[PDB]
Design a protein around this ligand. Sequence first.
Ligand code: MG
Length: 728
Amino acid sequence: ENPIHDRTSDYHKYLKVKQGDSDLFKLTVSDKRYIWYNPDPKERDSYECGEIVSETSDSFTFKTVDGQDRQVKKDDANQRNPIKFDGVEDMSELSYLNEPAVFHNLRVRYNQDLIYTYSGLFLVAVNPFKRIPIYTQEMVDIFKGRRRNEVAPHIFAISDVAYRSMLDDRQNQSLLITGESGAGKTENTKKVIQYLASVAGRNSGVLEQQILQANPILEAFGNAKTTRNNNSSRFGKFIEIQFNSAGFISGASIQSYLLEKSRVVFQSETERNYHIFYQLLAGATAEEKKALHLAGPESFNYLNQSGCVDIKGVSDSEEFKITRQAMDIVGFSQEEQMSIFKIIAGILHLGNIKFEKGAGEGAVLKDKTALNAASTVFGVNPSVLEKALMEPRILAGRDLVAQHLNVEKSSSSRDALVKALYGRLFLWLVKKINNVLCQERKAYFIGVLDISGFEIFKVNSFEQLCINYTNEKLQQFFNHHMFKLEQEEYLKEKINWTFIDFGLDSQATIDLIDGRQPPGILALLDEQSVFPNATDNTLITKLHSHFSKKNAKYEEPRFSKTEFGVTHYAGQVMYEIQDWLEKNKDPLQQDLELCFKDSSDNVVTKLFNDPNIASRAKKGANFITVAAQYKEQLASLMATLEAANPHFVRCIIPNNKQLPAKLEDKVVLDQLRCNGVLEGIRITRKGFPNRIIYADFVPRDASQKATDAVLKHLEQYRFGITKIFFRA
Ligand SMILES: [Mg+2]
């Protein structure tokens, strides 16, 4: 408690509000009252401060920056909290709770690099887009074991609360970090793992280092630069840190989700492919480059299409050293790593294969430099691969028929092979890692969820619907645990609570997407995926007839025939239907699988012969679809979190330019609205947060009134059947 109460410490310098000056005290003592108003009535999110000069029984009259006088009815007034509240660590304490006031406090805090603020029971994290030194080992030690009230808001603080609640209650916990693309999820995820790895680690603790080095691996193959984030996680993950009864870390398990493997073969302008492609070409030795027939990223069709090969302030050559070091710590062998880079080098070669029209409408390959280079590194027969690309054999009834695919379909099958290769390598990486950390049968666990977030682009596809649908369910889980389950408890225990509707329900949008009866978008997509004469247009035509003018969350646009709109909690998203059928089916010519099953490389062969990696579950006579499969594993995850005690962290992006020291009014407030932040504060103030059973609620044995005496010795708090609740 030396540095907590020492103004000289880095703690107070970087985690506490700076001491106000002589002049600020004179304003903190003022009797004047102020108000938040909109100078431009229809610019609803930009406010200014004004002094209240007079009031009637129902109205305030205040002054504008210009000097004019404006009038507002008290029922519609956003009063400004006294400035003594400016910078408060928990905004439950604010007297007036309105949008401009909540944003104001955060602003006051953001201006001094105070990115963490509590909103009742959950935490708010505003991305600084700059490195601030509050994640050192010294800071870890300060927060170790401290109550939430005793120290300042911090990701370590709520991580510690989950750890203590795990041991006190003997139950599993979850740390759910929400936010849109670029808001701060993965960065805060890393800190949660850091803190838990330290306060619960063993002081020969190599397991703990191994857990820390597992994420740098997945980021190199799993993250990429998008228009909204230079280190965008193109996959979701549930990280399950495991402990023993004693409370020390016993193991860990990663469950990956929804890899955007369509990115390996296509990227929008200014976007990049997965980091690892640029780390190899930039950090590979001359020996390696010569062995894998490599060149610069400008020479590969999968990397020379968006116009961008760099990320500002990132050395791909240097990042390559980090992932190789991380693979050493986790225990990948030298030949494993070399086989991994063969697959990456081979994928890039496959991308430069150009099919051209032959004598007939079928395709031909006049230049086989890329084909041979790929076959070389993979260890497969090139002419077998060649026939498997352009001439795959299928069954027609029972006859064995050989196709002759045109240029278009030959390139698509080549892309299918690439995406299959990369997607299976990723599951392999996660699988090898999970096995190195599968060393003890857990007693409890603290689950950390780090998903891809809400994202909108000029062109949104099946991948964006799955991402945004996942973010819609997480927001509903926040709504569920904060408002419905909360009041249901109050109602059940009969403490005379009048139900409140907070107006936060994403169920209509969720049913529209994943509903079975009536069928939703994914159900109709699955239905068309197996219908043999279905097209991308017969699909959206089907979606319009089912939901246009029928479901209030669905819009058939008048300006386009291949797009449809879904109204999410974070906003309407228009989705392009192109390629949805083939993306849901995820086809791959089996002749291509056969060719790689005969591969020289040990890794490649396990990617195509290991049943857990290479098989696909069958739904009758058809393979299970991407939609149906992801739905199953999403339901399993949400079942895991409903059984665990949730701790929420709401990440907020300050602007859409990835810049520091720039907190934009209307970008922040929209996230505060759709996240339900203020609703989450009101329920904690109006409501009663915790309840302990009567028996455990000073003669220490007994009658529900036994516990009444203690408070007497020490309306405000109420009694219910079987439990006792507290307020504030
Ligand atoms: Mg991320």
